Motif scaffolding. Structure first.
Motif, PDB file in Angstrom:
ATOM      1  N   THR A  91       0.950  -1.357  -0.125  1.00 54.40           N
ATOM      2  CA  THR A  91       0.109  -0.149   0.075  1.00 54.40           C
ATOM      3  C   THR A  91       0.972   1.259   0.002  1.00 54.40           C
ATOM      4  N   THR A  92       0.219   2.394  -0.473  1.00 50.63           N
ATOM      5  CA  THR A  92       1.053   3.629  -0.562  1.00 50.63           C
ATOM      6  C   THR A  92      -0.075   4.648  -0.244  1.00 50.63           C
ATOM      7  N   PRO A  93       0.214   5.615   0.906  1.00 49.80           N
ATOM      8  CA  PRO A  93       1.233   5.305   1.675  1.00 49.80           C
ATOM      9  C   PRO A  93       1.175   3.979   2.433  1.00 49.80           C
ATOM     10  N   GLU A  94       2.417   3.747   3.214  1.00 48.51           N
ATOM     11  CA  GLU A  94       2.626   2.588   4.091  1.00 48.51           C
ATOM     12  C   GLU A  94       1.696   2.311   5.088  1.00 48.51           C
ATOM     13  N   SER A  95       1.421   3.025   5.901  1.00 51.77           N
ATOM     14  CA  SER A  95       0.457   2.811   7.301  1.00 51.77           C
ATOM     15  C   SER A  95      -0.208   3.948   7.704  1.00 51.77           C
ATOM     16  N   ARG A  96       0.053   5.207   7.209  1.00 50.54           N
ATOM     17  CA  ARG A  96      -0.766   6.249   7.710  1.00 50.54           C
ATOM     18  C   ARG A  96      -0.650   7.418   6.510  1.00 50.54           C
ATOM     19  N   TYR A  97      -1.678   8.497   6.603  1.00 51.01           N
ATOM     20  CA  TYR A  97      -1.763   9.581   5.795  1.00 51.01           C
ATOM     21  C   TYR A  97      -2.401  10.441   6.609  1.00 51.01           C
ATOM     22  N   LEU A  98      -1.582  11.661   6.406  1.00 51.17           N
ATOM     23  CA  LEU A  98      -2.201  12.910   6.922  1.00 51.17           C
ATOM     24  C   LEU A  98      -2.614  13.765   5.981  1.00 51.17           C
ATOM     25  N   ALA A  99      -4.095  13.790   5.895  1.00 48.76           N
ATOM     26  CA  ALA A  99      -4.739  14.725   4.897  1.00 48.76           C
ATOM     27  C   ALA A  99      -5.487  15.818   5.358  1.00 48.76           C
ATOM     28  N   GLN A 100      -5.276  17.218   4.683  1.00 50.47           N
ATOM     29  CA  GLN A 100      -5.931  18.183   4.908  1.00 50.47           C
ATOM     30  C   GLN A 100      -7.306  18.241   4.173  1.00 50.47           C
ATOM     31  N   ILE A 101      -8.169  18.608   5.304  1.00 50.42           N
ATOM     32  CA  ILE A 101      -9.729  18.799   4.587  1.00 50.42           C
ATOM     33  C   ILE A 101      -9.531  19.543   3.417  1.00 50.42           C
ATOM     34  N   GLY A 102     -10.456  19.220   2.449  1.00 49.48           N
ATOM     35  CA  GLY A 102     -10.759  19.804   1.039  1.00 49.48           C
ATOM     36  C   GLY A 102      -9.713  19.427  -0.213  1.00 49.48           C
ATOM     37  N   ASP A 103      -8.665  18.457   0.456  1.00 43.83           N
ATOM     38  CA  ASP A 103      -7.838  17.914  -0.774  1.00 43.83           C
ATOM     39  C   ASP A 103      -8.428  16.705  -1.408  1.00 43.83           C
ATOM     40  N   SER A 104      -7.641  16.306  -2.254  1.00 38.32           N
ATOM     41  CA  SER A 104      -8.005  14.961  -2.997  1.00 38.32           C
ATOM     42  C   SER A 104      -6.864  13.977  -2.754  1.00 38.32           C
ATOM     43  N   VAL A 105      -7.038  13.041  -1.877  1.00 39.61           N
ATOM     44  CA  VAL A 105      -6.334  12.040  -1.416  1.00 39.61           C
ATOM     45  C   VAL A 105      -6.580  10.526  -2.212  1.00 39.61           C
ATOM     46  N   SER A 106      -5.532   9.920  -2.915  1.00 38.03           N
ATOM     47  CA  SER A 106      -5.750   8.450  -3.183  1.00 38.03           C
ATOM     48  C   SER A 106      -4.805   7.494  -2.390  1.00 38.03           C
ATOM     49  N   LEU A 107      -5.522   6.489  -2.219  1.00 39.18           N
ATOM     50  CA  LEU A 107      -4.767   5.254  -1.394  1.00 39.18           C
ATOM     51  C   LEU A 107      -4.778   3.958  -2.196  1.00 39.18           C
ATOM     52  N   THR A 108      -3.619   3.581  -2.527  1.00 37.91           N
ATOM     53  CA  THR A 108      -3.462   2.563  -3.417  1.00 37.91           C
ATOM     54  C   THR A 108      -3.091   1.311  -2.803  1.00 37.91           C
ATOM     55  N   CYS A 109      -3.426   0.202  -3.386  1.00 43.15           N
ATOM     56  CA  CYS A 109      -3.280  -1.122  -2.635  1.00 43.15           C
ATOM     57  C   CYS A 109      -2.912  -2.015  -4.013  1.00 43.15           C
ATOM     58  N   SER A 110      -1.623  -2.594  -4.129  1.00 41.84           N
ATOM     59  CA  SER A 110      -1.099  -3.506  -4.796  1.00 41.84           C
ATOM     60  C   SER A 110      -0.781  -5.007  -4.251  1.00 41.84           C
ATOM     61  N   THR A 111      -0.670  -5.830  -5.319  1.00 44.24           N
ATOM     62  CA  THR A 111      -0.357  -7.466  -4.930  1.00 44.24           C
ATOM     63  C   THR A 111       0.635  -7.777  -5.857  1.00 44.24           C
ATOM     64  N   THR A 112       1.462  -8.730  -5.636  1.00 42.65           N
ATOM     65  CA  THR A 112       2.379  -9.375  -6.519  1.00 42.65           C
ATOM     66  C   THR A 112       2.182 -10.879  -5.976  1.00 42.65           C
ATOM     67  N   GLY A 113       2.252 -11.813  -7.237  1.00 41.59           N
ATOM     68  CA  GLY A 113       2.359 -13.080  -7.125  1.00 41.59           C
ATOM     69  C   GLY A 113       0.861 -13.517  -7.292  1.00 41.59           C
ATOM     70  N   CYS A 114      -0.084 -12.781  -7.932  1.00 38.65           N
ATOM     71  CA  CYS A 114      -1.313 -13.057  -8.211  1.00 38.65           C
ATOM     72  C   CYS A 114      -1.907 -12.638  -9.493  1.00 38.65           C
ATOM     73  N   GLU A 115      -2.191 -13.339 -10.504  1.00 39.42           N
ATOM     74  CA  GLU A 115      -2.749 -13.061 -11.647  1.00 39.42           C
ATOM     75  C   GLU A 115      -3.990 -12.004 -11.721  1.00 39.42           C
ATOM     76  N   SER A 116      -5.021 -12.617 -11.149  1.00 42.34           N
ATOM     77  CA  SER A 116      -6.378 -11.790 -11.293  1.00 42.34           C
ATOM     78  C   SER A 116      -6.752 -11.580  -9.795  1.00 42.34           C
ATOM     79  N   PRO A 117      -6.173 -10.651  -8.876  1.00 50.01           N
ATOM     80  CA  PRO A 117      -6.688 -10.770  -7.515  1.00 50.01           C
ATOM     81  C   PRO A 117      -7.915  -9.699  -7.476  1.00 50.01           C
ATOM     82  N   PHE A 118      -8.764  -9.788  -6.582  1.00 54.11           N
ATOM     83  CA  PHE A 118      -9.924  -9.107  -6.433  1.00 54.11           C
ATOM     84  C   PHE A 118      -9.964  -8.239  -5.176  1.00 54.11           C
ATOM     85  N   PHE A 119      -9.925  -6.881  -5.183  1.00 61.99           N
ATOM     86  CA  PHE A 119      -9.769  -6.106  -4.105  1.00 61.99           C
ATOM     87  C   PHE A 119     -11.091  -5.427  -3.486  1.00 61.99           C
ATOM     88  N   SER A 120     -10.917  -5.108  -2.326  1.00 62.99           N
ATOM     89  CA  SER A 120     -12.068  -4.724  -1.694  1.00 62.99           C
ATOM     90  C   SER A 120     -11.604  -3.930  -0.394  1.00 62.99           C
TER      91      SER A 120
END
Length: 196
Positions: free
Chosen positions: A5-34
């Protein structure tokens, strides 16, 4: 098979901003995120699964995004989970210095420094300084009530003297949070004393 994941474990976001949390995997062809929050409430964000990467986008950030988001990746029969704690804060504008009147040596006056739309205010510190002498420091003890933008202020009274002429009244507002590098933690306003 692992999850990142990015960020690693915590994100400090200021109200009014646009923030994106990403989640990735390795070792899987077709994973299902939730995604989901710890207490299970609306994400108040948009999910976008693309290949082996899922992106939760909160825009604009609000009090509804103040949770620990949990990304879950399923690969056939195996599941992996990883959370990201999102903390929000509001510190949009500089403080304001208000003099109750004109500066006259010998006559007491009241200074009032205020900061608007601040969250969380239990991590706010206001310092009023005459030159480099600290006149007063104000705190707002750990106990809000609800998530809301507030305008807190510091108030002090003092008698100006002929020696104060030329000195600057400096009001410093400090938000004690776990700063995001370039993210401001200190804002201040100055006012030159013109004693008569």
């Amino acid at each position: 098979f692992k999850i990142e994941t990015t960020p690693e474990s915590r994100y400090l976001a200021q109200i009014g901003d646009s923030v994106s949390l990403t989640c990735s995997t390795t070792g899987c062809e077709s994973p299902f995120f939730s995604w989901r929050t710890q207490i299970d409430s609306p994400l108040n964000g948009k999910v976008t699964n693309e290949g082996t990467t899922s992106t939760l986008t909160m825009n604009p950030v609000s009090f509804g995004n103040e949770h620990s988001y949990l990304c879950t990746a399923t690969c056939e029969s195996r599941k992996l989970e990883k959370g990201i704690q999102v903390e929000i804060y509001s510190f949009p504008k500089d403080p304001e210095i208000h003099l109750s009147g004109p500066l006259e040596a010998g006559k007491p006056i009241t200074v009032k420094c205020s900061v608007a739309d601040v969250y969380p205010f239990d991590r706010l510190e206001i310092d009023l300084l005459k030159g480099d002498h600290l006149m007063k420091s104000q705190e707002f003890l750990e106990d809000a009530d609800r998530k809301s933008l507030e305008t807190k202020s510091l108030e002090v009274t003092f008698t100006p003297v002929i020696e104060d002429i030329g000195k600057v009244l400096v009001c410093r507002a400090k938000l004690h949070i776990d700063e995001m590098d370039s993210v401001p933690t200190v804002r201040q306003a100055v006012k030159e004393l013109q004693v008569y």
